[PDB]
Amino acid sequence: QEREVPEYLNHVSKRLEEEGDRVITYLDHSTQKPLIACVEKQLLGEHLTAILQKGLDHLLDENRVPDLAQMYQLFSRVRGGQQALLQHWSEYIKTFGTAIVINPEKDKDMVQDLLDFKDKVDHVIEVCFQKNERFVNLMKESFETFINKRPNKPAELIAKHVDSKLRAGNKEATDEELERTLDKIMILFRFIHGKDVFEAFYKKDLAKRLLVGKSASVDAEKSMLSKLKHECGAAFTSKLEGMFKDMELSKDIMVHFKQHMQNQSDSGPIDLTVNILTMGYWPTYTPMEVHLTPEMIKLQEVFKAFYLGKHSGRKLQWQTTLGHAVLKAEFKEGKKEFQVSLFQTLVLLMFNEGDGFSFEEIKMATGIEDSELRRTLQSLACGKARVLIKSPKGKEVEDGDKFIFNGEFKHKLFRIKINQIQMKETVEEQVSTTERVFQDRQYQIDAAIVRIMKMRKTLGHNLLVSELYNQLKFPVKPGDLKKRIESLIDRDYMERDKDNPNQYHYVA
């Protein structure tokens, strides 16, 4: 009640260490153990909360690994002080994890902080708790109890950060670290719940990663398929391996077509490339109304011709906007090459035939929807206008864009890769990619509950929730439980047993 909690802890440490040698020289061994028992009651006995809540969490936040190990000793010797240690420090885990994801204004940085708290608690176990396992039990319990509460802020932020770690830079060439931080991704986000939204978003992420730019590594994606195969269903990693098999099918079609133009001897500059896919293992894509230069339409018909062979049973529903393409660009003061997107490639295709178009037939002769075309003009316009030049300036954009293509263009590099768009995405794009999972759980829980009542006739709702939580990779809301109860009654697999929702039957 005079010194600080760490000061009193060091005093207790040294004062207990005093009482040994008293016996060692002169006092009695058989009263050494009564002496330490009494003294440890006098110092540490009956003070296992006012030392061990604040002065625990205070010196954990200060993270003095010497005194944390000291109190670990000083409360692993004592009568039961490690129980107070486990409870106070585990509540400390829950709250000091909870100081991340419940913050809706602070979603720009969540994943790195989660990695940080994971790292800190791991280090406090491995030295400050000296690889005891009770602490690990409280850790995992506390983490899962925490993240059952917010499922679909983290898994989406986590998916974006997983994709961010799946980028090809010049800074990283040791994928071993990215293997190790990938191991931390798997282990740490096994605490994070709602994995179906992460799963579908990772379909979106491999789409946005292959379709523009290039991945961090081949073995990185292979290791992720093998790792995410674990901890989820074995029919939950059928689509991803289907992605890479469909990519190999498209490459084999590429080899076949290149061999079939080996005797036609292409020397022309105009290229067509379609990597074709099936809708069972990929994100779904529906064509949107867009306008194509008629030679591209000729290439579409060529694509039909080479499409109709090789496992016929095939019928066109084409996409002609989702790729990125390399293009040479005429300007004054040099001819450099652009790596750009099809939304912008059509823009640049019209800025060959003339300079002087306006947003009316830029809206029309592209055909591009408003949501895509605004963000198309947020790249290389709304700033840095030396290729396209848009009459509204700044973040605010009005419907009056007047364009005259610029002769002037300056940069110090070749292969001018100015392409945010397809390695970016919009808010309602993310929201819609979430709703394609929201009322997609419907058939999942439908199948699960029809199988349950086909297995056990009576099951209260507080047990249906637990069987579903056992079975599924995401947490099911109480609203969705009412939703499936009512729809099962609509399709005659439930009857309310005893005229209340307490129990049910499988009678129609």
């Binding site: 896919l277 030679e295 996409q319 790729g323």
Partner: peptide, 21 residues
Amino acid sequence: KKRFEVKKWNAVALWAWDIVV
């Protein structure tokens, strides 16, 4: 020949079903 001379068009797309449900 043009202000962008066409060197590469590349696309990703889906091959679709053709059997009755």
